[PDB]
Write a protein that binds this ligand. Structure first.
Ligand code: MG
Ligand code: MG
Lengths: 336, 336
């Protein structure tokens, strides 16, 4: 029995992505019940990604899980779910997450354990220092620096150098940057990378538009920092084409349809000699903890989505000494 | 606590691969104990494959599992095991199988279920009709035909056509052929495939030498039947290079180091649009059942290794209506 309902996320402060800012995030909460056990799932829909409460609710209304008598049939069930529409990846991820939570609960084990991973190998999560006045930027950097081991800064915008200079003036913490397809000039991107390297940046994400894979490859081949693909991929079938152009890939549950496909993407990337990082949207601890289950296998992680909302519905993974920390709760590791 | 000992397999009849005939098979049985629970593993070493009782026993003696207090640490443990030597894949597979059996038992579930597969989707296994005089071939074919849905024939010899016609004179069952790198001329290989298809053959395995990948791609591109790679690959790192040259890959536990890598190979092959088949050496039901755990994801399966030995130590998967049949026992699904 699957039930679902809209649950708008309330953000603590204005959150900006490229040229889009917001203080809330459409979201749908899902639950799958089987013999008295409940698995929790979630779909998060940043507006610019194309899904809405309406599209997600409508997709979920197409899903018939009552015809399936065994929750452990993840391959068959999720293949069926994927077949219902061409995309709606966040809606599909919600079903996948709830099913994994349910299955893990029935097995009495967290997915990091089912997958055979060492929870002590979880990564440090980045936390974003948003664009603002120099004084505010310096203030916010000082206020959080003591809780994280690495900070994230979004570039590919107006005053990238100034932002880095401002932040670096009050902290020596390593910085990961996301250019979000902001640099269209191949040489400018490479020069920026060298400058950022000099300023203590340790990783670069999607420096150029996905259409310019050729230019991206040229940059990565000469880059002293690992370059990760984000906008350049969504699902499993998009990974192989990036071999040789990117150092690694970024995986997000809302983009890839959930945990099962995410794990396959980790396997594929690694098998192809590529590195892996994991990201997230502003989400409750349901989706954040779900993604955290495979974090012991990633190089970088931006798993702070729940920290930006004021109405989390679950207690799941926590940031301890700046490190994503998995509890021993079965399934995706959350308590409602 | 891991213990191990040699256990030579006794074959029911002379078994021949290419020009090498034998009546026994070196094998090492492994056991890993944790809090009263025991996981069973196995290494099978057909002489021509490079490993021996000595090499396997010596490798196992290097493995320190006592330093590991959690059997669920499959990633860390098996990474460590692999790091102990360049090859010894059968010896490594033995540890992997025992660990999966143990973990599955601790979770109270068989691996097909842990992997989220539908056991009803297991494949029909081939059974081999060995080369011999026409009278014997017809007799052996008639004797087993009623228990299988597909038969295997090893070609690449000097009497391939007669062999196929002799078998076809007593049965209408589909046939899968393994040329074992027997055809050196790509034109001949292609012509043979067309001839075989007209004779009811449904799959071709390793038609040419692995050194002639270009000719293989040439054949496969215009082949009316799926072409699978066997001798052309050993492990996960060898798969990608075969994309576009082969229709699919053949996975064997003794070649790939076990279940964990095998499953990754299935994922990789499928992600790359390649099909998958699974094979085996003459083995006890331990290794056969272990490989059978992921058979619901394969297109073809040669999982009859235990049927050729007279001293099986386990009761595991069975052939029912010609289909590999998984029981509900946890781990790899065997009873000692
Ligand atoms: Mg990004
Ligand atoms: Mg073969």
């Amino acid at each position: 029995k699957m039930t679902f309902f809209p649950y708008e996320l309330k953000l603590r402060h204005v959150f900006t992505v490229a040229t889009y800012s917001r203080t809330t995030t459409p979201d749908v909460q899902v639950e799958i019940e089987y013999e008295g056990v409940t698995g929790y799932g979630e779909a998060s829909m940043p507006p610019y990604l194309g899904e809405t409460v309406e599209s997600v609710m409508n997709f979920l209304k197409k899903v018939n899980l009552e015809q399936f008598s065994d929750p452990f049939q993840l391959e068959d069930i999720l293949s069926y779910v994927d077949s219902l529409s061409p995309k709606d990846t966040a809606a599909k991820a919600a079903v996948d997450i709830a099913l994994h939570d349910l299955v893990g609960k029935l097995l009495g084990a967290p997915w990091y354990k089912i997958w055979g991973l060492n929870k002590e190998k979880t990564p440090s999560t980045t936390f974003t220092i948003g664009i603002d006045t120099p004084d505010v930027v310096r203030a916010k950097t000082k206020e959080c620096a003591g809780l994280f081991n690495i900070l994230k800064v979004k570039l590919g915008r107006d005053n990238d150098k100034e932002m880095i200079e401002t932040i670096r003036s009050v902290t020596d913490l390593p910085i990961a940057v996301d250019a979000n397809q902001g640099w269209k000039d191949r040489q400018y991107a490479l020069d920026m990378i060298h400058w950022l390297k000099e300023k203590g940046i340790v990783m670069i994400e999607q420096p150029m538009p996905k259409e310019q894979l050729d230019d991206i490859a040229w940059v990565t081949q000469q880059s002293p920092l690992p370059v990760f693909a984000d906008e350049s991929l969504q699902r499993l079938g998009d990974v192989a084409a990036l071999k040789g152009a990117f150092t690694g890939i970024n995986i997000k549950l809302m983009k890839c349809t959930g945990m099962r496909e995410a794990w396959k993407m980790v396997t594929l990337a690694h098998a192809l000699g590529m590195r892996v990082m994991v990201g997230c949207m502003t989400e409750t601890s349901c989706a954040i903890s779900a993604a955290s289950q495979f974090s012991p296998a990633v190089d970088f992680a931006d798993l702070d989505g729940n920290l930006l909302i004021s109405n989390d519905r679950f207690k799941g993974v926590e940031v301890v000494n700046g490190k994503i920390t998995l509890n021993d709760l079965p399934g995706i590791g959350v308590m409602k």
